[PDB]
Symmetry: C2
Subunit: 157 residues, 2 copies
């Protein structure tokens, strides 16, 4: 449940959860000196037993504590946007704000329930969709771009 | 009250105590995310009051938490022996066991408490010391080396 992104430079060994093999998310530390994602290690105690997965030492959830130093460094490492095309890095904490605007991202066109790229998403909807709502100039009824001719033969004018 | 030693790979800011400017000793972490020596932050609290130095965020002693991940990192860092003349590098874990047997540590002479390197004491006792005991063939009574001249000119034979 770690951050599934491509860090730049690649994520260092000490900033990786041994459970999900990804960057620590809401980092917590065990008394035996090991870092895990909070939900990763709580589930491990809740599923695999009240132990530490690595060293088999007994692990207390209430003796766990938030490693807010590990968390701080990870959220400022330069990450690549997982969506296609982006080549400018950013601090991982801002990746949440980027994906509410990402122009390289991929979002759907509900006129036909289908994705595009954000620089092309609105470009297709208005001149490219075979299912785009283009009404007949005489009947004023919305029908597909690929269905514009078939109406005109039996079009109530 | 921190680790006073010269690290073979230069010490990184992540392992520095912002109080004593030295490598963390028994590293503990604050709820705000800043590492300190266990002694330093306890000293900084029970001498000033309940605070974190750098950020001034609320901090109690029972709210402290050992950072053994940082501690295990620090004890595996290569260091050089602080004793002058010693040229053997080692991981910080073994530094103490070397420092109690190191030839280049200063030792006090058992006659005049003059300071010498530990290996040199074996020589200074038998050849260089002025207070080393010597026996006179006529009397063979224990006496200081510097006192052999005033004794050989009046020896009762
Ligand atoms: Zn562990
Ligand atoms: Zn994890
Ligand atoms: Zn992007
Ligand atoms: Zn479309
Ligand atoms: Zn029509
Ligand atoms: Zn702090
Ligand atoms: Zn310190
Ligand atoms: Zn030494
Ligand atoms: Zn002496
Ligand atoms: Zn004599």
């Amino acid at each position: 449940q770690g951050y599934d992104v491509e860090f730049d430079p690649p994520l260092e060994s000490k900033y990786e959860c041994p459970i999900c093999l990804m960057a620590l998310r809401e980092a917590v530390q065990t008394p035996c000196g090991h870092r895990f994602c909070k939900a990763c290690i709580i589930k491990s105690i809740r599923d695999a037993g009240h132990k530490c997965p690595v060293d088999n030492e007994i692990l207390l959830e209430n003796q766990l504590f938030p490693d807010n130093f590990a968390k701080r460094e990870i959220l400022s490492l330069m990450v690549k946007c997982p969506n296609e095309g982006c080549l400018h890095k950013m601090e991982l904490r801002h990746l949440e704000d980027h994906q509410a605007h990402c122009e390289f991202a991929l979002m759907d066109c509900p006129q036909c329930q289908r994705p595009f790229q954000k620089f092309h998403i609105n470009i297709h909807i208005l001149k490219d969709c075979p299912r785009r709502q283009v009404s007949c100039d005489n009947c004023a009824a919305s029908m597909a771009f690929e269905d514009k001719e078939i109406h005109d033969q039996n079009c109530p004018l």
